[model samples]
Target: LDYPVLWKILWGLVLGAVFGLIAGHFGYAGAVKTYIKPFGDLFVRLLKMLVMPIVLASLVVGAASISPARLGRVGVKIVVYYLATSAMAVFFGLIVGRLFNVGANVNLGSGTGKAIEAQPPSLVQTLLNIVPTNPFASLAKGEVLPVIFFAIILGIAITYLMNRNEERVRKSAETLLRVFDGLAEAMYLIVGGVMQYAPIGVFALIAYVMAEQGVRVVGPLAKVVGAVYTGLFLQIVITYFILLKVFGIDPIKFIRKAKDAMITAFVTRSSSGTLPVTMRVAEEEMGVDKGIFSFTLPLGATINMDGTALYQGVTVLFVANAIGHPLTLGQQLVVVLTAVLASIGTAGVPGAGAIMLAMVLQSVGLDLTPGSPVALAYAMILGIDAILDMGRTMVNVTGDLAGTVIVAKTEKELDESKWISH
Candidate 1:
């Protein structure tokens, strides 16, 4: 009984071996990929479908319910703090990555794994594309950036202007959130049905990744990935724990209450998908302000990705190390800069981290060869992406809760008796 992580490690390693052996014997990794892995992607997609409506509803309700001054003040602070923390996270990731020299160790042109694909428009082009032709089409495509753009504009218009139609407007808005919430609830119902089969999805996703990618990739790549994952693990435990304790909350119990949300985030790998669960824990367990919990939790899922910022920085170092290029101090600053903005620029799209990584590499005048061993390394991470995804997502979802708690506490939006008692 090594306690925590023992079961996780054993299951991963044991299943990996079994799958590796089976794959090698069959001489066909393609069968698993073609037959097994798409289901994992499908699971991810099903979760992603809820993102836009949840974001739109929560942001509107969060905004409209507050006074203009309070809304502006709180909203600005949240976004600013989010951006600042993202920059700092990139710094944290970069320093750890550099200390480990993740990049110094990479081999050239050693392509064997699957690579993440990206095509970035210029800044002006990206801006122009933000205005969606049809919001429904954007949602249908999982085009998050455009949807977010639309939501923000809609929220602003709804908030700032006095509707001659005030009563109708208020009713309509709440009805909209309720409707979205209903759809979101329906999603929850459907997930219960789908989760009955999560064992199959998880098993297939893991097996397909390892079998298709092979172990050769894991040996060379493990250190870089390990360093990032390790550092992130440390941040989740130490940084977040310390943050909570200093503020007089029991970090362990706080996280314990969020267990179901963490599990949902992990298997699905979409922060947005876990919104209702996260908010439920925030309100019911943590005793967060109903207003703050309703508003902050959903917004946090979409924009605040401390975990993604960490991943972006660490992945850059690993990829940069694979090539001959080394980061100068000036260059490391770029890691921080890129990671923060990358989250913003790539928001709403799935695999934003990978796409952002490609953009950063190109920005610094680096390009990875197509089909390099790094791709194979990527495959390994992707195989267990759900594992790391769960950890990061847990930290991520809970971090949002912690932030809302802290913010609400500061603003006197917290229910102390409820927090302590229930």
Candidate 2:
């Protein structure tokens, strides 16, 4: 195994760190932050533009195509399974971190970086927000959570009214979904077109992230980072393989198939951005059933993150321990519980994992206030957050890919030859 990727990664680090040093020294980090951000923003706009359309189409088309009587039977298992896996993943992370004492004895009170800002809105607000007190205003702001809410409701409504006076509405929605399907194809093309720009995107992103922030933020958080990485890698190597064994699927095949998504996600530091490729791999390359992969990949991008979620747990513990604010057993239980909820809560947003960290810290009673130990701890970990981001993202993608296969297996939609990779 030549492992050419490892070499590319090593060189990428050399380049990234060289840029990292320059950014760290003069505090020119803002240059990359400002410049690359717009490019990132542009990418996000492209995704959000399609968000409502895609969700509305997938759900409405899926629901409308299914007979009403059988809708309850088909949808429940999938939804429950998704929610369950999310909780299990976060809980597992909490359990593993406590067992290892990764957060214990961390030295706090060092860095004084910026405090985390509040996220867009909680999921409930995002939901209540969709009825569109003002659809025009909602569309103008690009508030996706609310947008997603409206689209879903509107989609279901269209299906419901198919029997009533809105034959026109039914036709219009069906046509719109077809158009969305076409747009999705175009977006796939755009993703490919943009991916050719990835070397540029990755370089700019890495250079900017390293230079603007200086690795000082991530530097001190090594123990927490290491513990989470170790835990996730083990979860995949041991537990994931056992699950694969039960399915009679080869684990290595799954890893090999998942590489492109994992690699792109690691470098890009985004699950939402990497989703199109993830679905492409699981469906086209891995030969999972289209119906299942189609649904799960998009949903998983929003919720699944055994790796990223676990890292959040590790960070919460590390920060608390380092600052001499060690969580009690009951408090640790809260961490295990809240982490699962947080995993679902923050899915599909920008800088999601980092933002979630701010909340998780609050959950176990570790505040992210400036000059606090946890804040300092976060600054220390910023340096290598990029590196571990790759590992955790790999785990994140592995869960999505693996889950698709498992669900497809249940549906009898799996193919061994495709999954049995080297």
Candidate 3:
């Protein structure tokens, strides 16, 4: 109910950045990588360990409890919200990239020309792959989308059975639902325990990043970084702020409560990895109904990639400019479309933003052959991806939380008392 942990995590981020700056400046990056990074890795491992169980149990419980009609309605609302915002984010990124002229006068020869192996999935294949043939294999492999599919289907089936005429059948469905309800509660307890160590983990993660990249990485591609970050900042301010205001939710209080998840997303640079924290913030701090958030948040984590879409927009423009192949107005629109589609296609894929960028670039006819100009520029972008990923992932998670809160409000599932008092 309280949030002393939030302040501690903030301090961890600040102190960790300071520590990393000093260490990087003094050339102790190897030491930080050796000694400090493992703690951060452990923290991530802890979070990752909870993602599948929490998502599976919570979503199943949520789906089983909610009526089919309400589930369908919330599903439509959340999906529309995600797609609309993702498009808006891409447009914002393009505007920012143009304003900053992100790749103008940039030297592209320093790239190591590292080969990118990300093969963008076709739309049909991506959709087909969502329904797992083996749910256990999906769970074991930590494949979020398939597990979500399985859980939701299984939950819906149980919901159907819960109303059956046979007393025996109804009782069995009730018992199964209770088991998942208990499992979800147990996962929340583990989340509490895991989060107690968040400050330490956050510190080590920030320290390692700073020590490794330092100031040197920012010098050459500062404009591109500025463009992407500006896009993210604008998306949060213009898009998310407007959503909260229009929905009559107090924007300042919402931000105050949501910062914990945002910070964790930034530190972890992973939406799926940050799911437990995001769920906690939504349900505990924002007072969103579990039925809404449990359905929306996991889906949001998978496909509500506002930040990644924006990154694709900015980087597409950057690549086009760097290669002396500026995109026309129509081509920029194509970038917007490709980015949104790619966001869906690349859901749950590691390094998704970069892969999405590659797909967008290819759509606009930019060559990505190894050692080509576009590839070199892409390599440079990948170089600073970790720093960029932190901000974008934070925004992505913010959008998810925002969507959950808004949907809950509209559905009359929000508990104002829970958020208002705290």
Candidate 4:
């Protein structure tokens, strides 16, 4: 069938879940970890390998394509809509986290024998570090925020320079711009090649999580999963639909056109990996302007992570509750803000969410040092991360398209006839 990839990944998720549970129950955890887990680990590594190049190139191309000086009324609206929905997502997560009290039933056993060595830097330090002292070092270290900061400035500067009437300067700027764009294209091709192995990798990831967490971790894991999925669903059904209705678009029509993109994201679990599909579906099926979707979608894939923000919010509260720490109102607020930033800076890949969870937990001082309650709690949650990752990714892509459609409507770039006909 023409629809084979999505089917394979979905089947992998379903079958892996069932098989992992059986293996865990039957004491095959050791075998799963030893044999099955490495494939998933390798897959994560392969994804990570693409992250820096993709982020640098994509952000650069996006910034240059939609230069800030040229970001008229529509551009401003796009940024505002993206940030507002992302914040709302985090807020929704916090509410549901408390409503569910997801962390209250922690068993915190003999600990996971894991150690988190360092804490997050202070807010001031983090802000300053965004403008890196050494851009190369930042890229080498896979420090996302610093790299984004550099790429953005470089892109804007290149666009500004290239726009100059001077021939020599413009030529140089154009050369650099074309090089980065080519690199971005090359990286995406690599990603496509890697995705052919996705189902097998997904199976390994799910099996490993099930084997590692076992039954003891079920209660809290279920809570975390439930809270995340619930928040994402609301964002899709309520928040996004509200956005469409307010903007005078038929929510049903938009959603119908967006289903292929959403389903592709859900199974792939990588917004970056699903970008080609998203762009095609959006521009062709939904009739969003290519100029608008081209820039916004790529930028959104990198930084517009409403779903990840929500996931982090619930995770922080869950970690705090599991560790016996009562988060002050201010602490919870910090969690929301930190989560929003983390989501933007996070890689749109499977394990990036898990890493961001640690960072958010650290920001609020939930204490993930070895033998701490939070550390143990984190270990248990790690096993089920892949499952939650899939949900959040689909949410991330949904927000991307939602922002695209809304902004397109405002820009008067949306083809109403084509959108409705589709």
lDDT of 1 at 18: 69
Residue 340 error, candidate 2, Å: 3.0
lDDT of 2 by residue, 40-94 (tens): 4454345344444444344444444434444444346556555555555566677
Question: Candidate 4: lDDT of 204?
Answer: 81
In order, candidate lDDTs are 0.59, 0.59, 0.82, 0.73
Number of the top-ranking candidate, with lDDT as the measure: 3
Worst 10 residues of 4 by lDDT: 106-115
Candidate 1 lDDT tens digits, 1-422: 24244224225434644684488457777777787678767755655555566555555455555555665566665666466556556666777677666654545552222234533334676668779999889977867556655665665555555344678767776666566546545644555555444444555555664675444345545666576767676666766677667777778777766665565565455667666556656665677755465556666776775777677667666765565444565666655565565565443223555556655655554434456655543444455343445445655676677677666765655677764544
Cα displacement (angstroms), candidate 1, residue 150, comes to: 6.0
TM-score per model over all chains = 0.70, 0.70, 0.92, 0.69
Top model number, TM-score: 3
Clashes of 3: 0
Over 190-270, each residue of candidate 4 has an lDDT whose tens digit, in order, gives 766666676777778777766665454466577778788888888888888898899887888877777756755765578
Clashing pairs in 4: none
* Candidate 3 residue lDDT tens string, 271-359: 99999999988887898888889889988888886887678777777776787664775677665665676667444433667766766
Winner by lDDT between candidate 4 and candidate 2: 4
Q: How many backbone clashes does candidate 4 have?
A: 0
